[PDB]
Design a protein around this ligand. Structure first.
Ligand code: HEM
Length: 154
């Protein structure tokens, strides 16, 4: 699949807003993910002890992790589809070291859309959400293909 320049513009326009507060968006997204799909929390040995949203918000390590994740995702989105090089190491660590099923990538994609919808309604209307979903589907599709080449079905 391929996004048009118009769709990329919608994606990058709302992403520019997210970059005004990467740490904050990172926390909201992971808290949403962990609360909505608690099973994903078990994949993080560093955070699986967190019991409440309050503890999650107060975790300095979780906040730093969120920044690392969103920074990596932002770099991929800014490539506008030409992300082969960026995807290689990400696909290897998540398939081989962390063992993250494609299903879980769908869950975090849902969390990202939910947070952008809540925080940026004016810049995240129907068309913008469709563009973001398409960009994330492309990401998940290419990651899945790499998973297979690497020997991980998940
Ligand atoms: C938007 C998709 C995602 C991106 C861009 C992303 C990115 C990253 C990055 C850059 C790191 C640090 C470097 C590395 O280990 O490769 C990381 C670590 C990790 N990711 Fe992801 N990730 C994504 C989704 C997920 C999901 C859905 C899970 C599982 C629910 C997951 C689990 C992990 C784990 C367990 C680590 C190691 C954390 C640690 O122990 O420090 N990731 N991820």
């Amino acid at each position: 699949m391929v996004l048009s320049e118009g769709e990329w513009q919608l994606v990058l326009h709302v992403w520019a807003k997210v970059e005004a507060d990467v740490a904050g968006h990172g926390q909201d997204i992971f808290i949403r993910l962990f609360k909505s799909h608690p099973e994903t929390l078990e994949k993080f040995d560093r955070f699986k002890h967190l019991k409440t949203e309050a503890e999650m918000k107060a975790s300095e390590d979780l906040k730093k992790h969120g920044v690392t994740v969103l920074t990596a995702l932002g770099a991929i989105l800014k490539k506008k589809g030409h992300h082969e090089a960026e995807l290689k190491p990400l696909a290897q660590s998540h398939a081989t070291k962390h063992k993250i099923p494609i299903k879980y990538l769908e869950f975090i994609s849902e969390a990202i859309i939910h947070v952008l919808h809540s925080r940026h309604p004016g810049n995240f209307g129907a068309d913008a959400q469709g563009a973001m979903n398409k960009a994330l589907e492309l990401f998940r599709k290419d990651i899945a293909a790499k998973y297979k080449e690497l020997g991980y079905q998940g």
